[PDB]
Design a binder for these strands. Structure first.
Ligand code: MG
Ligand code: MG
Length: 196
RNA sequence: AUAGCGUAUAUUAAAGUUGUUGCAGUUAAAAAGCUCGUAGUUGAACUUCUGUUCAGGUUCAUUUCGAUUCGUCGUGUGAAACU
């Protein structure tokens, strides 16, 4: 299952595990055939989440190569559902994203596109951390000391999926992104003129 | 006022009575009869945010302490904004 990676050269126990998983799946499910055909992985990181629960929960973040992204997003629910089954942890997916530095412009003729920027990329990471669902809203809080703070408003209907994942997400985001993230569930409010 | 003191004239403050700071324009002087428009002046938001760690001063405070004196130094400790 080095076929599932871009380096193929070296893989951790964790990456051996995920590779073998995606193998097992491309074999079992005709559902995911095409989707797992097109998905190549760059990287896999593992995380340990320890909370006041005394529950130490292993959580896995897997990095899809950018060209597999559309297909990944198409297969997301089925995929995370089956992968959470094949390992006793929970899974997340991201796109592998480069970041171009502000003041070191390497080539005279290349304008660093905003698609790769510290911010935009980090934000995108959040969008992926929630991946089956989406932000209903996002707000930033300034505390009195000068700490920035994030809090995010989420579709009611997706509570089932996202409830336990929250801690994992805040741990991951605090780690990679350096950001404090909070969540809320509201109902998605559509403003309709209904004719009764 | 005073070995000086009147007067005339230009100029300075008085003057926010030339106004960048800083004026006015319904009725005291003051918005052009009305639109288009070139020079001129004027221009929406986004890009390494951010946490951690070490040092160095510099300010800050003092139920930290000291040292001397007519008040500086040293030392805390923490607070910081740094670099
Ligand atoms: Mg009149
Ligand atoms: Mg501007």
């Amino acid at each position: 299952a080095l076929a599932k990676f871009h380096k193929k050269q070296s893989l951790t126990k964790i990456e051996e595990q995920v590779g073998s998983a995606l193998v097992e799946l491309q074999n079992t499910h005709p559902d995911l055939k095409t989707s797992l055909e097109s998905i190549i992985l760059t990287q896999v990181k593992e995380f340990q989440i320890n909370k006041t629960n005394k529950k130490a929960k292993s959580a896995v973040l897997i990095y899809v190569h950018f060209q597999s992204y559309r297909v990944l997003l198409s297969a997301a629910r089925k995929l995370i559902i089956e992968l959470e089954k094949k390992l006793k942890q929970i899974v997340f997916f991201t796109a592998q994203r480069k970041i171009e530095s502000k003041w070191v412009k390497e080539h005279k003729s290349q304008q660093r596109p905003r698609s790769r920027c510290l911010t935009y990329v980090y934000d995108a990471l959040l969008d992926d951390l929630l991946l089956p669902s989406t932000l209903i809203g996002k707000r930033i809080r300034a505390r009195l000391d000068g700490t920035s703070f994030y809090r995010i408003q989420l579709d009611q209907n997706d509570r089932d999926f996202l409830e336990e994942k929250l801690d994992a997400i805040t741990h991951i985001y605090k780690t990679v992104t350096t950001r404090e993230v909070t969540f809320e569930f509201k109902e998605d409010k559509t403003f309709h003129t209904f004719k009764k």
